[PDB]
Amino acid sequence: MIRKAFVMQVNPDAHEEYQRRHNPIWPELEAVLKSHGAHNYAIYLDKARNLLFAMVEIESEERWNAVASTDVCQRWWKYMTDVMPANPDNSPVSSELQEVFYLP
Amino acid sequence: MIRKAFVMQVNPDAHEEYQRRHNPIWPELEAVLKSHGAHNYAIYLDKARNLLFAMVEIESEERWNAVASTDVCQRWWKYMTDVMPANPDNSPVSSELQEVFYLP
Ligand SMILES: C[C@H](O)[C@H](O)[C@@H](O)[C@@H](O)C=O
Ligand SMILES: C[C@H](O)[C@H](O)[C@@H](O)[C@@H](O)C=O
16 A cells, blocks of 8 residues: 655654554544554654654555544644644644665 | 564665665575565665665564674674764664554
């Protein structure tokens, strides 16, 4: 599939709360993520830098992009603004990373 | 397997060279990485921050740790000191990330 990686940020005082909110995430959000073709979605926390390293395999660029249009992702992102920096539309501040090495 | 993620840094002026050196990496280093149980070793570059987010699945913590004792990893790391921050023993400056979310 298409390997995608990106990085987001997290509030310095919300490391524990951010993690707790993903164990588990809302069942309706999980359903939507899976329906939209995501696989092996993993997020890692860089405690010293308040950074979140995410990796996810998706079947479709467009479908993955469509998650932002769903109500559940929208309310999820609104909900998450209290623990991490977000863009005006409530999507988390994020940057796409460039794959430089891959060894199966 | 055991999912491991860590972050390293890269010199601001060596983004292109760092990537070129991994396509492909030395064949004897690949052989050693695989012999020591590494799977799906991926490294992503954060251009804005000069950061390298890496993720690798390994069969054994001890075997993975043993890679640093091999001559090839040692000469590889000595070689890489010219493009990225390194510890006195030449291993790259690195920090273990904490997995906070995982959706198969
Ligand atoms: C499930 C995942 O969290 C979501 O896909 C991301 O956009 C971000 O909100 C995570 O905190
Ligand atoms: C193959 C890989 O590069 C190695 O495992 C890391 O320690 C670092 O040197 C990479 O640049």
